[model samples]
Target: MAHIFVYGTLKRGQPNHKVMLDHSHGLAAFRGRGCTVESFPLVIAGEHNIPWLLYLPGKGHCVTGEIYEVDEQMLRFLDDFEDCPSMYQRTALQVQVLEWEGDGDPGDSVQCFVYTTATYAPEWLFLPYHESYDSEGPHGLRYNPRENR
Candidate 1:
């Protein structure tokens, strides 16, 4: 199994969670919550008002999100969902595990594949940085679900 860090819609209780749930089948298991070991910009931008984790590490906050243990098939599904290499890039990054079922303390760090973007406008950096993203949060930008798009 491979570890995947999700910071946006793919997270639990979020709009796109259903998409992941439907495709993951029994191949994906929720691991826990974690925060990126390094800082990165997490913004809600684009025409779809989607949340994006900018690849510019050390430039923003230590973004927090959920971690999942997924089989190779599930990982491929996620890559297709995110449109890897075009919309978002999947790369391994260290996350400080916060609450997990595994054999590790809260502060312990682990490597996980995070879907982040390098293809964004410069103005996106000027947007608000979310330590953790919530579609209904006070950040103002509501995520545009797939059905509505």
Candidate 2:
């Protein structure tokens, strides 16, 4: 089993949770809130109009996300979904997983495979990090900024 961190569609209660359901069946799965230990901003790609977490080492916000214990196949599926090394690149990252309702202990930190944009682009825009995705209906695609962009 492998640990995969998802901050967008693959997250639970989102549009693509079924991918996780289909791929990660054998391993024990745990759901919890996690963020990048390093400062990495989660932004929406202009071309895809989808969320992409960028590896911005010195500038970023607390990106909210979910952690999953998946299998190799699951990672492949995710890689393809994110268009690995093109749209997004797969890399190892330290995610601080905070225990919420069930399963694991509090303040658990783990290294997992995180998919981030291969390179920074001019059109990429920062996504407001909502405390809870449940409240960010449509997986945050509908977020309206109050400040000038």
Candidate 3:
């Protein structure tokens, strides 16, 4: 029973999320992490953001998605997909979960993973929930919407 920070398609109700739940339990909305799916190469159409943003491989900028905590079991399915030996793997990262509101003690360092690709680059931005959300899920979180161009 360990907590893992998940982003991308692993958030609750997403295809990946469904797969994990179907296999294990101990899931919780304990925290959130960020991702670089908005960057080209990984943002595939019909699956990238699932709804709001369309994939434009090699043309899209970086976007950060929400982070969440689930059991280590979730890694089973993830391992199946991102199980390329030494190519791209999942590893733990420390994240800060802000308080609901106000200046409360930041949450502890929750274990999360980064898409450690051989082509990894820090230049890619880690967007906030608003800038990186997969807007078609249960948490259709419209943190930021266009008021004008």
Candidate 4:
């Protein structure tokens, strides 16, 4: 299975969540919230807030999102959705989750996939309209920026 960290429209309770729900085992039974060790600005792009982690790692607001374990088929759908290698590139990076199978500490790191913009204009990245681009799930978890690193 592939684990994905979705921070934008693909997140739960959103219009794009259906894309994953439509696929079999597209999302893991359990989910958790997390962010990058470094920082990246989440900007308003079209109808969604997209994270440009490639260009500005370690130098922006800590990003927040949820992680899900999905089968290979579901990963492919995400690749197309983000337009891999063009609009947004799929990447694997270290993330700090609220918890990892009950074994992770406050700052434990887990590897996961994320969709990030490959090349964006300098002005494209901006401060988030709110603390998080999207609302937290029922789990209602929160983490500190220090724990992410």
Candidate 5:
């Protein structure tokens, strides 16, 4: 079983969610776990886990993403959808999921896809919201602060 971290348009009920949902399993979520969620161009980088791209040197807050177990075949499809090779590739990183007690499972590592790029950031970047910040509705494509560029 593989876990995926979904933060952008791939959230449930979101646009890209269906693309993966149609071919995944163990669809569960862990609470209180997140890395700094920021915005970047939809453009894909040249390789997977490329170091050239990073989270704005040191900024931003984590957002809610998903962790689902999928098969190898499904993972392959996701790679393509995420624009691997010519673009971005999926890599697993150690993360903390709040209240995420696995099913009495040990020696297990939760994984998620980290999309990276050579250069891209919002016009403004700042601390994440303490409360729920809706960017899907009225706020649409929300911008936190003026990005350094």
Candidate 6:
């Protein structure tokens, strides 16, 4: 199974979590929660107020999110969901495990595929760096759900 780290809308209790479930066709399995081993900016930006995990590592916070094990089919589906290579690029990154059902300690580090973007405006760097992205948070930038887009 392919491992993926989801930090934005695809996360639990977020607006686009449904896409991960409905589109994966039961091929996706939750593994645990983790935080980036290297710091990076997690910003809410754009006209739709989408959460972007910038490719610029060691520039912001050690972003926290969930991890999942998915089959190749589910991986491709997620690529489409995130518009990979266009909107976001999936790459392997080390993450510090925070919680896991499998055999692993809290501080154990594992490599997982993270969807991040390098094609963003310069001003996005000036936006608030969120350690975690919550749609209803006080960040004031509300995420526009797919249905509303």
What tens digits encode model 3's per-residue C-alpha lDDT throughout 1-149? 44444445555334445454454543545443444433433322222232222223334444445554545655554556555444455544444443222233335433345544444433332322233444364653422323241
Please, what are the lDDT tens digits per residue for candidate 5 over residues 43-97? 1122221112333323334454545555676567766765665555455554344
Residue-pair clashes per prediction, in order, are 0, 0, 3, 0, 7, 0
Candidate 4 per-residue lDDT over residues 1-149, each given as its tens digit: 76667665555445566667666625553456676665665555443333345445665666666777788878877777656778877777777786565443435667788777657776665544222454354423332223333
lDDT of all predictions:
0.77, 0.61, 0.42, 0.60, 0.43, 0.77
> How large an RMSD does model 5 have?
8.8
Please list the residue runs of candidate 2 whose C-alpha ends up more than 4 Å from where it truly belongs after superposition.
24-28, 100-107, 123-135, 138-149
What is the TM-score of candidate 2? 0.70
lDDT of 5 at 126: 29
Stretches off by above 4 angstroms in model 3 are 24-68, 99-111, 120-130, 133-149
TM-score of 4: 0.70
Candidate 1 lDDT score relative to the true structure: 0.77
List the candidates' TM-scores in order.
0.84, 0.70, 0.44, 0.70, 0.53, 0.85
Off by over 4 Å in 4: 25-27, 47-54, 102-107, 125-131, 135-149
Q: Which stretches of candidate 5 lie over 4 Å from their true place?
A: 24-58, 99-111, 118-135, 142-149
Report the lDDT of model 2 for residue 39: 63
Better of 1 and 6 by TM-score: 6
Return the lDDT, model 6, position 3.
73
lDDT of 6 at 144: 69
In the range 1-149, model 6's lDDT, one tens digit per residue, is 77777775677467667655664353777788788978988877778777788888689898888888778887777678777899998878888877776764435877888888878889998888768887667657677666464
Clashing pairs in 1: none
Whole-structure CA lDDT of model 6: 0.77
- Residue 114 error, candidate 4, Å: 0.4
Which candidate's TM-score is highest?
A: 6
